[PDB]
Structure formats: structure tokens, C-alpha cells
Design a protein around this ligand. Structure first.
Ligand SMILES: [Cl-]
Ligand SMILES: [Cl-]
Length: 298
């Protein structure tokens, strides 16, 4: 359950190494994680799509998991270039996306710009309207608001994240998961981030969240993704939890009434990293949804 019974493969993308899980055969299901996780996040979900007869492909984002740590800024722009390049390197086509957090932004953008290549999209705790973009820190509540302001403040964020590893050591196990992560699980999540410098991607990601218009690029991407989501005819699947974080009940209710061709699966108690609290419901869910829809790209 904390076990990771997958070998990883490596491929060169834009001069750097991307590590990835590659299991099964045939139609690809591409799993995209966010901050501060890796392909490890999907370890208990992957076996469900493989047994359903699909090829499970789960890369580690650049600078994360077992992927390379190049001297780059790790902005949204950077991450999309490596993931698009990864898709190209593997020649992935007729894709089902399974996406979370910043992975949802990268994933939806890819579907948006390549509608001929994406069969279907499963997502959860996504950075997408109506919840995103955020108008202000105040709009995030008395906990997340000041926390993200801190992360986005010079010196403060560096001390918290680079020196303290706060995203990995606190936000992930304490705020983002209902159950207690085991020692083996925490070891896996901290393994890519033993040094100050290595932690940069976990600091840059909260600095990418579009709040009060900043930064402009991520804001534009999230808004255009929202337009794609409301207009796209392709089969979609949403997992959500109570109370949730990016997607509380009223956000889900809105999405369920307005997104075309959307299946919604409540998983019970959870906040953000739903895969840790309900991997089997999520796994069974994706497989069942694929069995009924058999989605293919036009
Ligand atoms: Cl983040
Ligand atoms: Cl479960």
C-alpha cells in the first residue's frame, strides 16, 4: 500500500531526463500529478487501469520524483514544455488523462490544444473555474489565504519551503490527507527533496497559482481551460471529497450542472490528495467509467 511495485523508465525530453511508470499495453492512460507529489501518488490506482486492459503511463514532472533537476525556473510554462515533450517522445495518442492539482492544468491545456489526441479526462481537485482563479488571498479563507501569501512573499517562502521543506513535510501529510501517511510513504515523498535547492519546484508551484491576476500566464491558462471544460463534448469523470479543498460541495454541484458529459463520483472524507484517502474507489471508478464509455479520440 506504501509499496511501489513498478520499475521506472527514463526518456530524454528537452535535454533532460523524465522518469516514468509504464505498465500494461494498448490505449494510454496518462496520469499527471501535482505539488509536491510524483508518480508515487498514483501507485494504488494504476493497477486498476492496467487490469482494465489499458497502458498506464505516469511520468514524474521535471524536477520531481526521479526526473532530472535542471537549472530552470519551474514555472507553469516550463512544466508544460516537458510534459508535451514527454507525450511526443512516447508518441502517445488516443489518450485518457487522469489528472490532479497542477497536473490538471497541464492536462486540460494539452486536451484544449490537441483535441484530436485526447479521448477522455478524469480529474480531481483541479485548478479550474469556478474556484480558480482566486480574486485575492482573503477569498481563500483565514488559513490558506495567509499561508499562500507567505509562500509567495520573498524570503518568507524560501525559508518555509527551501530551508524547511514545508510543502512536503506539513501541507501534504497534515492538510492534504485525512489518514496518517506511513513512514514508508513519507520517505517516498521526501526522497526527491533532500536539499534546499532541490525543493525549488515545491516553492515555485504555489507561486504559480493565479491570485489577483498574478501570474498572468497561469491565469490565462486556467481561464482557457475552464472554457474548454464547459464546451468539450468528450467523456469526463470527477472525483471529489468532503470537505475537499479546491473542490468543496458547492463547486462540484455547479460543475455537475454545467460541464457536458461529466460523471461525478463522491469518495467520502478527504481534502486534497484524494488518491491517498480513497485509491480503490478512484481506481474502480476510472475502470468502470472506461468500461462503459470506451472513449476514443476523434
Ligand atoms: Cl501549489
Ligand atoms: Cl479506497
Amino acid at each position: 500500500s506504501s509499496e511501489f511495485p513498478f520499475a521506472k523508465r527514463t526518456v530524454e525530453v528537452e535535454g533532460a531526463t523524465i522518469a516514468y511508470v509504464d505498465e500494461g499495453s494498448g490505449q494510454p492512460v496518462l496520469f499527471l500529478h501535482g505539488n509536491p507529489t510524483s508518480s508515487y501518488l498514483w501507485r494504488n490506482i494504476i493497477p486498476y487501469v492496467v487490469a482494465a486492459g489499458y497502458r498506464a503511463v505516469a511520468p514524474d514532472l521535471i524536477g520531481m520524483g526521479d526526473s532530472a533537476k535542471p537549472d530552470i525556473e519551474y514555472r507553469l510554462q516550463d512544466h508544460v514544455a516537458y510534459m508535451d515533450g514527454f507525450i511526443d517522445a512516447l508518441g502517445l495518442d488516443d489518450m485518457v488523462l487522469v489528472i490532479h492539482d497542477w497536473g490538471s492544468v497541464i492536462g486540460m491545456r494539452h486536451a484544449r490544444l490537441n483535441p484530436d489526441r485526447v479521448a477522455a479526462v478524469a480529474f480531481m481537485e483541479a485548478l479550474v473555474p469556478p474556484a480558480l482563479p482566486m480574486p485575492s488571498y482573503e477569498a481563500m479563507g483565514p488559513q490558506l489565504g495567509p499561508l499562500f501569501r507567505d509562500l509567495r512573499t520573498a524570503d518568507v517562502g524560501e525559508k518555509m519551503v527551501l530551508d524547511g521543506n514545508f510543502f512536503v513535510e506539513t501541507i501534504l501529510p497534515e492538510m492534504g490527507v485525512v489518514r496518517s501517511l506511513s513512514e514508508a510513504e513519507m520517505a517516498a515523498y521526501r526522497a526527491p527533496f533532500p536539499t534546499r535547492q532541490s525543493r525549488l519546484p515545491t516553492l515555485q508551484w504555489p507561486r504559480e497559482v493565479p491570485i489577483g491576476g498574478e501570474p498572468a500566464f497561469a491565469e490565462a491558462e486556467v481561464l482557457k481551460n475552464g472554457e474548454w471544460l464547459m464546451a468539450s463534448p468528450i467523456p469526463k469523470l470527477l472525483f471529489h471529497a468532503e470537505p475537499g479543498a479546491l473542490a468543496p460541495k458547492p463547486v462540484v454541484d455547479y460543475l455537475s450542472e454545467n460541464v457536458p458529459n461529466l460523471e461525478v463520483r463522491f469518495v467520502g472524507a478527504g481534502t486534497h490528495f484524494l488518491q491517498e484517502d480513497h485509491p480503490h474507489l478512484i481506481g474502480q471508478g476510472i475502470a468502470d467509467w472506461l468500461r462503459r464509455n470506451k472513449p476514443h479520440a476523434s
